[model samples]
Target chain A: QAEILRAYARILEADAEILKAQAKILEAHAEILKAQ
Target chain B: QAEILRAYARILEADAEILKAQAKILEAHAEILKAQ
Candidate 1:
């Protein structure tokens, strides 16, 4: 069960990284609009 | 253990929904750029 929980933790971490990347993408889009 | 797994699955599903929403936001951003 500990191992399973660790695996889930890793997955959640990866998901968090993806969310961060998505946030960066949104920021970039906002910058582009601002430049326009 | 089963309950824990189900909870994790629900969290994952919610994460997926969030990802989908992010994708839509990106799409909208592209549309805005295209309009520009």
Candidate 2:
């Protein structure tokens, strides 16, 4: 049970990475618009 | 085994939603900056 809980925590940490990637993507896109 | 894999798949799908949320947040912030 404890191991499973840890696994869940790790997955949640991954959620943060996913969110950061999204922000980077948005920043890249905004820069492209500025270039145009 | 199959059920656990499916559970992981759902988490990945949720990652997409999280990414969309970050994009929307950045869009809102950009709008505020433009307004100012």
User: DockQ scores for all the models shown?
Assistant: 0.13, 0.14
Q: In model 1, what is the error at residue B4, expressed in angstroms?
A: 13
What candidate 2 gets wrong by more than 4 Å, as runs, is A1-24, A27-36
The per-residue C-alpha lDDT of model 1 at residue B21 equals 59
Name the regions of candidate 1 deviating beyond 4 angstroms: B1-36
The candidate that achieves the highest TM-score relative to the unseen native structure? 2
lDDT for model 1, please. 0.68
Alpha carbon lDDT at A25, candidate 1: 76
Error of 1 at A31 (Å): 0.8
For model 2, how does the per-residue alpha-carbon lDDT over B1-36 read when each residue is reduced to its tens digit? 445744774687688677777677766666666665
lDDT of 1 by residue, A1-36 (tens): 556765766676677677667767766776777676
For each candidate, what is chain B's TM-score? 0.71, 0.63
